[PDB]
Structures are given as structure tokens and as C-alpha cells.
Amino acid sequence: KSEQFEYAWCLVRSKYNDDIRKGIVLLEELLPKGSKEEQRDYVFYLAVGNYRLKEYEKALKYVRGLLQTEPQNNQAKELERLIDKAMKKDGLLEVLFQ
Amino acid sequence: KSEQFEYAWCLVRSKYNDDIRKGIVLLEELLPKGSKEEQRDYVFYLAVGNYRLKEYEKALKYVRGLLQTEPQNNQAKELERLIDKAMKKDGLLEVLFQ
């Protein structure tokens, strides 16, 4: 189980979008199985994976879910601040042609 | 066993040089364990991993070892032709200051 995560961790790291989609799904499967601390890590990495796929909605959903339980996790705060920059630049680009 | 390779396959794919070094080592461990066909695949991927680490010597050692048994594997031939281009450009760059 602690190695089924390492696989998904490497997968959510990969340069190929398909390895990333596979990495999330393995993390979504490992999520109810997990412990308190394990779920906090899995959720963080699900936000990382969803962000690397421009799925910024779902990525913000996780990182805020974690930030409600851990308001002072600075790495979660930094990941939420990176999701906000991508979304506001993306929203600017969308409406550039009016 | 057929999943200990998938891990190392994803690892030898990664953007991080340390995940790659780990991926090779897992493939070097899986190499005697393997079957005929499995060893041919592992060796191919060891050449891929060693090439992505600029270890072009070791990468050529594998891809030629495979090419001796499989002279017509075109993917092994293409990987050996990519290792030759990297080495000849690298050798040109080394001696640019004379």
C-alpha cells in the first residue's frame, strides 16, 4: 500500500499527461484506504496532479479541502497560491478577444 | 514482477534524474529474474535510461548487446543511431577549445 503510492507519486510526476491521469486515479483509489496523515498527503498530491493538467477547478477543490483542516500548512498555501495565479492568467487569456 | 517493471518504466520516464537512476537500478535487479523476451525489453529500457542521463557509453553497451541477438529490431537500431548522434555532437563540443 505504501508502495502503491510511490508508483502513483512517480506517475503524477511524469512528463506525459496520460501517466498523470493514471496517477490521480490510483490516488483516488488509495484515498478511502488511507489514514488521517495519508489522506492529507494523497489530497495534496491530487491537487498537484490536477494542477499539472490545467484542471485548476478540481485542483483548488482539494487544496482548499486540505486547507480547511490544516490552515497553516504552508505547502498547501503555496499550492493554492499557484493555482490562483494560473487561473487568473488563464481567465485573462480567455477574454483577450473580448 | 510485471508491475515492478511498470514502476521502473515510469521511473525511467521521469523528468527527474534521480527517479531515472532509481529506475535503472530496479531494471538491473529485474534483469536476471527475467525471461528471454523480458530481458530484451529491460535491456532496451536500460539503454533508454542510460541515454537520458548522458551515460552514452553504458547506453551503447546495452543497445549493441540487444542488437547482436536481434539484428533487425528497428527500435534498437534507431536507439543506437540516436546514441551515436549524441556522442559525436558531445565529442565535437568537448574539443571546441582545442
Numbering used by the authors:
A (entry chain A), B (entry chain A): 32 to 129
Anything the authors wrote about it?
To explore this possibility further, we crystallized and determined the X-ray structures of the WT and three phosphorylation mimic-mutants of Fis1: Thr34Asp Fis1, Thr34Glu Fis1 and Tyr38Glu Fis1. Each of these mutants was previously shown to be sufficient to increase Drp1 recruitment to mitochondria and subsequent mitochondrial fission in cell-based studies. Consistently, we observed that the first 30 residues including the α1 helix were missing from the structure providing strong evidence that the α1 helix undergoes significant conformational change and is potentially disordered in the phosphorylated forms, whereas it was intact in the WT. We crystallized the phosphorylation-mimic mutants, Thr34Asp, Thr34Glu and Tyr38Glu Fis1, and we observed that in all the cases, these mutants crystallized as covalent dimers mediated by Cys41 disulfide bridge between two Fis1 protomers. As Thr34Asp, Thr34Glu and Tyr38Glu Fis1 have a greater propensity for a conformationally altered N-terminus and hence have more exposed Cys41, they crystallized as covalent dimers. Upon closer examination of the crystal structures, we observed that the concave hydrophobic surface in the covalent dimers of all the phosphorylation-mimic mutants was exposed. Our crystal structure not only shows the absence of α1 helix but also shows that there is no space for structured α1 helix in the covalent dimer as this space is occupied by α2 helix of another monomer. Here we showed that Cys41 is also oxidizable and mediates Fis1 covalent dimerization through disulfide linkage. This oxidation-induced Fis1 dimerization was obvious in the crystal structures of Thr34Asp, Thr34Glu and Tyr38Glu Fis1, where we saw a clear electron density for the disulfide linkage.
